[PDB]
Design a protein around this nucleic acid. Structure first.
Lengths: 82, 82
RNA sequence: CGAAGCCUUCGCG
RNA sequence: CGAAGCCUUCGCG
RNA sequence: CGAAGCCUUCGCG
RNA sequence: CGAAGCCUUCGCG
């Protein structure tokens, strides 16, 4: 797992986390924790969840980048574990 | 653990998480993920972390209530574990 | 006795 | 052959 | 929201 | 920021 997981951090973190989620029979989730700010400069706060494990919450400027950074944080956490 | 952990959900989640963290030799952290909103109506976003495990991020109106809500979520998860 | 944590109140900014 | 996901681009509200 | 291109991965062969 | 009060937990006697 670790090998491909490292690869996914640079190119496409969301894809790597979904891959991890499939290969362990788990459904991945990206929770929109919070939305704030004016419409032209909003701030989104996202959190990745896999099965029963929750990951670092992140601030981002767009929903896409919210998911990307949430995935990225989850991936770094999982790589750290071993 | 589960017995006392249930009790702390009503009275003081922050204390219960501190008990859990001590009794498994873990350092607890309450991360201020985000602050937003106007000065008289701020919104804070907190996340509890115990050792290497991160917990649901929560919204609250004050820092203390932020920590308490994060702790409460972590406790509900840990009771869920068994 | 020695600590730690929470909540509450009061004053100040 | 059948899915899914990123990258970029274009158009619509 | 509607598409195209390109990449990666999954699944059945 | 400076105090006060409560409750809870832990160790010791």
């Amino acid at each position: 797992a670790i090998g491909e997981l490292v690869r996914y951090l640079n190119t496409n973190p969301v894809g790597g986390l979904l891959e991890y989620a499939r290969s362990h029979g788990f459904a991945a989730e990206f929770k929109l924790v919070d939305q704030s700010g004016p419409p032209h400069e909003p701030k989104f706060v996202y959190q990745a969840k896999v099965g029963g494990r929750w990951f670092p919450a992140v601030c981002a400027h767009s929903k896409k980048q919210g998911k990307q950074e949430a995935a990225d944080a989850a991936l770094r956490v999982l790589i750290g574990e071993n």
